[PDB]
Amino acid sequence: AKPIADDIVVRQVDVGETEQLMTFLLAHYYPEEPLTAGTHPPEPEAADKEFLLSNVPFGTCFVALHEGRIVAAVVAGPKDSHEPEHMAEEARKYAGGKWGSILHLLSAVETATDVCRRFSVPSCLHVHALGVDPQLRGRNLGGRLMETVAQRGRDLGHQLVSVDCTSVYAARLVQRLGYQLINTLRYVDHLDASGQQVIRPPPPHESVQTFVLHL
Numbered sequence: 001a002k003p004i005a006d007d008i009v010v011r012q013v014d015v016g017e018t019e020q021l022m023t024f025l026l027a028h029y030y031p032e033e034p035l036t037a038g039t040h041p042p043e044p045e046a047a048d049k050e051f052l053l054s055n056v057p058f059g060t061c062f063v064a065l066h067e068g069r070i071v072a073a074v075v076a077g078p079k080d081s082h083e084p085e086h087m088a089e090e091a092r093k094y095a096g097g098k099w100g101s102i103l104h105l106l107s108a109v110e111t112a113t114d115v116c117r118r119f120s121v122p123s124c125l126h127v128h129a130l131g132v133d134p135q136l137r138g139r140n141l142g143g144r145l146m147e148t149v150a151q152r153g154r155d156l157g158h159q160l161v162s163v164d165c166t167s168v169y170a171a172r173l174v175q176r177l178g179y180q181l182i183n184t185l186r187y188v189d190h191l192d193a194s195g196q197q198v199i200r201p202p203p204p205h206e207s208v209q210t211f212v213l214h215l
């Protein structure tokens with residue numbers, strides 16, 4: 001438990017208490033997240049939510065509590081050099097649906113960045129999701145949760161954190177934290193096999209920008 005304001009506390013998410021975490025994500029992460037907001041239907045598929053929750057046992061997911069409620073959350077987990085092949089196979093299994101479209105894009109980015117080979121590190125702590133209650137945006141709750149993930153990464157011996165900023169607001173935040181931009185993929189440039197634009201999110205979100213932080 002880490003007091004980050006006079007009223008907000010950062011806590012680790014435990015394996016038994018994920019329902020309130022998912023309730024928060026479904027209210028304040030998924031509806032505005034550009035990949036989710038740019039594919040149909042608006043609601044995330046079961047496999048999507050299940051993937052996020054599958055990171056909880058790693059002890060790498062954190063929430064911010066205000067008055068006994070979650071007002072922010074970050075979901076992160078490890079990856080290594082097999083992640084590009086694994087994402088590519090996940091994308092083709094879910095091909096045809098919303099989660100398949102999201103994975104289509106995330107797999108293109110993972111294959112392009114390939115951070116473990118790129119930077120000669122054995123593993124990476126990847127941030128999968130970051131969300132802040134709209135009433136508490138502007139208070140660098142996002143930044144404090146990112147720093148918490150980085151400290152957890154250091155304890156775990158990771159030499160690198162990576163993050164795909166699908167949102168301009170996430171990219172601006174990690175820029176403030178000194179992350180290094182390593183890849184940019186504009187949504188208009190990312191097509192499916194039939195030549196159709198996969199993700200069509202609202203402006204101002206024009207690209208997914210992947211950043212890394214050396215630990």
Ligand SMILES: CC(=O)SCCNC(=O)CCNC(=O)[C@H](O)C(C)(C)COP(=O)(O)OP(=O)(O)OC[C@@H]1O[C@H](n2cnc3c(N)ncnc32)[C@H](O)[C@H]1OP(=O)(O)O
Binds near residue numbers: 029030033140142
């Ligand atoms: C790896 C990933 O998760 S990528 C996708 C990231 N998450 C999402 O898209 C869900 C959208 N949810 C959000 O919770 C937020 O926009 C976040 C977490 C990305 C950033 O929130 P914060 O940490 O509070 O942003 P930050 O502190 O840097 O700046 C917030 C303030 O409101 C703004 N702002 C932040 N987010 C938004 C937003 N989604 N829409 C409009 N304005 C925003 C400014 O950046 C800044 O304005 P101010 O100085 O005039 O007050």
